[PDB]
Amino acid sequence: MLAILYDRIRPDERMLFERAEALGLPYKKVYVPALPMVLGERPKELEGVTVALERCVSQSRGLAAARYLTALGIPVVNRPEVIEACGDKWATSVALAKAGLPQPKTALATDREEALRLMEAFGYPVVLKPVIXXXXXXXXXXXXGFQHQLFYIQEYVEKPGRDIRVFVVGERAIAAIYRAENCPLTEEVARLSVKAAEAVGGGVVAVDLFESERGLLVNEVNHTMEFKNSVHTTGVDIPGEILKYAWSLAS
Amino acid sequence: MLAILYDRIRPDERMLFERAEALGLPYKKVYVPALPMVLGERPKELEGVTVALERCVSQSRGLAAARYLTALGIPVVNRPEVIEACGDKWATSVALAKAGLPQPKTALATDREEALRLMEAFGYPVVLKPVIGXXXXXXXXXXXXXXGFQHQLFYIQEYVEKPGRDIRVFVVGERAIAAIYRAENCPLTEEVARLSVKAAEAVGGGVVAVDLFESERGLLVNEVNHTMEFKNSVHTTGVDIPGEILKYAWSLAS
């Protein structure tokens, strides 16, 4: 049966519980904080579990649990690699570059000085985001585990259009929204979103895009997509699609 | 040519520089802290670079740089996956378990309370190590527990009795090239060599130092290091560890 791993129940999780019940999809709720994860011995909580949906609000907890499930041989939706490829901006930007996908000009500095040189080279205004808006050099200076002293820098992008969030399930873009309003999926947006999903390892993710002057650019990819408002907005059963995908990977 | 990526020059790095020079292996030193890493545009510092040896003391810097090199299509010794599979104890223990390799009983808690339950279940004494970079009783446990993807994680291991000394094996590719006791030279045996190479393979392969426990239950893999230190081991083992590392890297050149 399906195991829905969680720590804090949000409306997203409740919708998952309700859809599973309505779909007749055998499942059980697994409270991760109290789950004993001893290598070599499957917990009683996981007895009968053939596939798991990793829904923890905490990234550290979710990734640690996804890693554990792989050690037990239980397929987990959004494998460890996808979760970390997504929750780490440098990792995600690197994955997009290797897949040759469009994104804002991006760079990474490993010390304060190089960060300044890069921002200066990029020309202001520039963007500085945590790996896991600078107006001028003055603002830059003022602002200034494997994440010790890293500075993720991106060019500031002009947006002729609204940002788009695309919900990708497997090889299909199933819904999209503007940033909220429904964004009727087009061939262009759908194909780019699925390729972005593939770039980070595949699975169930929300791809955030920028409709810039240079065209569609991939901004970020989320490994544990939130969709409570999007169901009504898009009219698409996102929770049900997610559950069916996970259930299909069952072993 | 080979690019040796570094931040702080330790004797290990100097030996690498000297062996490369003596071997006639075309290379250049690349100071990572000042390297501009912009995706889509290879830095001038990397002009002509066909393979890189990731030697930064800082793990965060080394992993970020290894990732960058993969984006540039430049092979890097100890790919990002290996560096992170190694610098993260839970990741490394999980990789060892999937490869079916022996190691101390290991567990991970994601909150203070579960950590206590586990330690209690393991029975004291138990070991508590930081996930990245001995509990006597419940009281000690509570005290210790109170004192990015690593927020609130508690790596717990059983306390192991060691009838023998700990062994550090230097693995280069599919070969265990040297080993030391913990320092004295540890003449490599079939058993130790095979386990060490399998442990290296389990985390993704490359150049790593495998630390083993000679316990009552036999050989157990304790940890795997992605940027092995070897300044003292060269003299201790009599093996040219730096040279072996460089030749392995150079062979992956593209």
PDB file of all heavy atoms in Angstrom, chain B residues 48 65 69 84 91 102 104 114 138 148 151 185 188 197 215 254:
ATOM      1  N   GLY B  48      41.609  25.397 -21.655  1.00  0.00           N
ATOM      2  CA  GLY B  48      42.507  24.270 -21.864  1.00  0.00           C
ATOM      3  C   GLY B  48      42.385  23.108 -20.887  1.00  0.00           C
ATOM      4  O   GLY B  48      43.065  22.084 -21.047  1.00  0.00           O
ATOM      5  N   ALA B  65      32.030  23.754  -6.623  1.00  0.00           N
ATOM      6  CA  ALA B  65      32.941  23.808  -7.764  1.00  0.00           C
ATOM      7  C   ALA B  65      32.841  22.535  -8.592  1.00  0.00           C
ATOM      8  O   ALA B  65      32.874  22.597  -9.818  1.00  0.00           O
ATOM      9  CB  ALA B  65      34.391  24.028  -7.284  1.00  0.00           C
ATOM     10  N   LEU B  69      31.898  22.382 -12.642  1.00  0.00           N
ATOM     11  CA  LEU B  69      32.681  21.667 -13.642  1.00  0.00           C
ATOM     12  C   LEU B  69      31.797  20.713 -14.435  1.00  0.00           C
ATOM     13  O   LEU B  69      31.966  20.587 -15.644  1.00  0.00           O
ATOM     14  CB  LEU B  69      33.835  20.902 -12.968  1.00  0.00           C
ATOM     15  CG  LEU B  69      35.157  21.644 -12.708  1.00  0.00           C
ATOM     16  CD1 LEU B  69      36.052  21.535 -13.929  1.00  0.00           C
ATOM     17  CD2 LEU B  69      34.906  23.102 -12.370  1.00  0.00           C
ATOM     18  N   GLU B  84      29.125  14.500  -2.093  1.00  0.00           N
ATOM     19  CA  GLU B  84      28.013  14.604  -1.162  1.00  0.00           C
ATOM     20  C   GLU B  84      27.645  13.264  -0.536  1.00  0.00           C
ATOM     21  O   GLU B  84      27.191  13.219   0.608  1.00  0.00           O
ATOM     22  CB  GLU B  84      26.797  15.234  -1.846  1.00  0.00           C
ATOM     23  CG  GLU B  84      26.269  14.490  -3.048  1.00  0.00           C
ATOM     24  CD  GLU B  84      25.317  15.344  -3.873  1.00  0.00           C
ATOM     25  OE1 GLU B  84      25.760  16.365  -4.444  1.00  0.00           O
ATOM     26  OE2 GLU B  84      24.123  15.001  -3.948  1.00  0.00           O
ATOM     27  N   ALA B  91      23.870   9.801   4.129  1.00  0.00           N
ATOM     28  CA  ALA B  91      23.965   9.444   2.721  1.00  0.00           C
ATOM     29  C   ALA B  91      24.961   8.286   2.580  1.00  0.00           C
ATOM     30  O   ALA B  91      24.678   7.291   1.922  1.00  0.00           O
ATOM     31  CB  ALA B  91      24.432  10.664   1.892  1.00  0.00           C
ATOM     32  N   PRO B 102      28.936  -4.315   5.146  1.00  0.00           N
ATOM     33  CA  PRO B 102      28.911  -4.291   6.612  1.00  0.00           C
ATOM     34  C   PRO B 102      29.284  -2.951   7.233  1.00  0.00           C
ATOM     35  O   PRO B 102      30.207  -2.280   6.785  1.00  0.00           O
ATOM     36  CB  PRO B 102      29.904  -5.391   6.981  1.00  0.00           C
ATOM     37  CG  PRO B 102      30.935  -5.261   5.878  1.00  0.00           C
ATOM     38  CD  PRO B 102      30.045  -5.153   4.656  1.00  0.00           C
ATOM     39  N   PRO B 104      28.512  -0.484  11.263  1.00  0.00           N
ATOM     40  CA  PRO B 104      27.901  -0.507  12.593  1.00  0.00           C
ATOM     41  C   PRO B 104      26.392  -0.289  12.461  1.00  0.00           C
ATOM     42  O   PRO B 104      25.934   0.336  11.501  1.00  0.00           O
ATOM     43  CB  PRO B 104      28.571   0.670  13.308  1.00  0.00           C
ATOM     44  CG  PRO B 104      29.889   0.807  12.606  1.00  0.00           C
ATOM     45  CD  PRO B 104      29.512   0.589  11.161  1.00  0.00           C
ATOM     46  N   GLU B 114      12.775  11.309  19.290  1.00  0.00           N
ATOM     47  CA  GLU B 114      13.027  10.045  18.597  1.00  0.00           C
ATOM     48  C   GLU B 114      14.480   9.621  18.792  1.00  0.00           C
ATOM     49  O   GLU B 114      14.782   8.432  18.882  1.00  0.00           O
ATOM     50  CB  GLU B 114      12.713  10.185  17.106  1.00  0.00           C
ATOM     51  CG  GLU B 114      12.867   8.903  16.293  1.00  0.00           C
ATOM     52  CD  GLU B 114      12.048   7.752  16.844  1.00  0.00           C
ATOM     53  OE1 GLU B 114      10.981   8.012  17.439  1.00  0.00           O
ATOM     54  OE2 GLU B 114      12.460   6.585  16.670  1.00  0.00           O
ATOM     55  N   UNK B 138      20.939   7.862  29.521  1.00  0.00           N
ATOM     56  CA  UNK B 138      19.872   8.745  29.057  1.00  0.00           C
ATOM     57  C   UNK B 138      20.167  10.206  29.384  1.00  0.00           C
ATOM     58  O   UNK B 138      19.895  11.100  28.580  1.00  0.00           O
ATOM     59  CB  UNK B 138      18.530   8.325  29.674  1.00  0.00           C
ATOM     60  N   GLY B 148      21.674  23.116   5.671  1.00  0.00           N
ATOM     61  CA  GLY B 148      20.471  23.132   4.858  1.00  0.00           C
ATOM     62  C   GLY B 148      19.619  21.900   5.088  1.00  0.00           C
ATOM     63  O   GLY B 148      18.716  21.904   5.925  1.00  0.00           O
ATOM     64  N   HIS B 151      19.063  20.169   8.983  1.00  0.00           N
ATOM     65  CA  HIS B 151      18.384  20.726  10.146  1.00  0.00           C
ATOM     66  C   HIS B 151      17.741  19.660  11.031  1.00  0.00           C
ATOM     67  O   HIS B 151      16.879  18.898  10.586  1.00  0.00           O
ATOM     68  CB  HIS B 151      17.333  21.743   9.697  1.00  0.00           C
ATOM     69  CG  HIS B 151      16.519  22.306  10.819  1.00  0.00           C
ATOM     70  ND1 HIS B 151      15.446  21.636  11.371  1.00  0.00           N
ATOM     71  CD2 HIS B 151      16.626  23.471  11.501  1.00  0.00           C
ATOM     72  CE1 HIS B 151      14.926  22.367  12.343  1.00  0.00           C
ATOM     73  NE2 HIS B 151      15.624  23.484  12.442  1.00  0.00           N
ATOM     74  N   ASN B 185      51.973   1.303   8.966  1.00  0.00           N
ATOM     75  CA  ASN B 185      51.592   0.724   7.689  1.00  0.00           C
ATOM     76  C   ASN B 185      50.785  -0.552   7.893  1.00  0.00           C
ATOM     77  O   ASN B 185      51.143  -1.402   8.706  1.00  0.00           O
ATOM     78  CB  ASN B 185      52.833   0.390   6.863  1.00  0.00           C
ATOM     79  CG  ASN B 185      52.485  -0.228   5.524  1.00  0.00           C
ATOM     80  OD1 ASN B 185      53.124  -1.179   5.081  1.00  0.00           O
ATOM     81  ND2 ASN B 185      51.468   0.320   4.869  1.00  0.00           N
ATOM     82  N   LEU B 188      48.087  -4.402   3.016  1.00  0.00           N
ATOM     83  CA  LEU B 188      46.777  -4.740   2.478  1.00  0.00           C
ATOM     84  C   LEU B 188      46.548  -6.223   2.224  1.00  0.00           C
ATOM     85  O   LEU B 188      47.366  -6.891   1.596  1.00  0.00           O
ATOM     86  CB  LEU B 188      46.530  -3.968   1.180  1.00  0.00           C
ATOM     87  CG  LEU B 188      46.062  -2.521   1.335  1.00  0.00           C
ATOM     88  CD1 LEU B 188      46.095  -1.811  -0.008  1.00  0.00           C
ATOM     89  CD2 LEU B 188      44.654  -2.516   1.911  1.00  0.00           C
ATOM     90  N   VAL B 197      37.291  -1.332  -1.768  1.00  0.00           N
ATOM     91  CA  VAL B 197      36.923  -0.970  -3.124  1.00  0.00           C
ATOM     92  C   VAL B 197      35.400  -1.026  -3.280  1.00  0.00           C
ATOM     93  O   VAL B 197      34.806  -0.206  -3.983  1.00  0.00           O
ATOM     94  CB  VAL B 197      37.608  -1.910  -4.149  1.00  0.00           C
ATOM     95  CG1 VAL B 197      36.987  -1.739  -5.529  1.00  0.00           C
ATOM     96  CG2 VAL B 197      39.096  -1.593  -4.203  1.00  0.00           C
ATOM     97  N   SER B 215      36.191  -5.029  14.122  1.00  0.00           N
ATOM     98  CA  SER B 215      35.341  -5.361  15.262  1.00  0.00           C
ATOM     99  C   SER B 215      35.162  -6.846  15.536  1.00  0.00           C
ATOM    100  O   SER B 215      35.663  -7.694  14.798  1.00  0.00           O
ATOM    101  CB  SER B 215      33.959  -4.738  15.077  1.00  0.00           C
ATOM    102  OG  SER B 215      33.195  -5.490  14.153  1.00  0.00           O
ATOM    103  N   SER B 254      39.207  14.259 -20.890  1.00  0.00           N
ATOM    104  CA  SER B 254      38.412  14.271 -22.107  1.00  0.00           C
ATOM    105  C   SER B 254      38.448  15.671 -22.700  1.00  0.00           C
ATOM    106  O   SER B 254      39.004  15.823 -23.811  1.00  0.00           O
ATOM    107  CB  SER B 254      36.965  13.874 -21.811  1.00  0.00           C
ATOM    108  OG  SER B 254      36.317  14.850 -21.015  1.00  0.00           O
TER     109      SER B 254
END
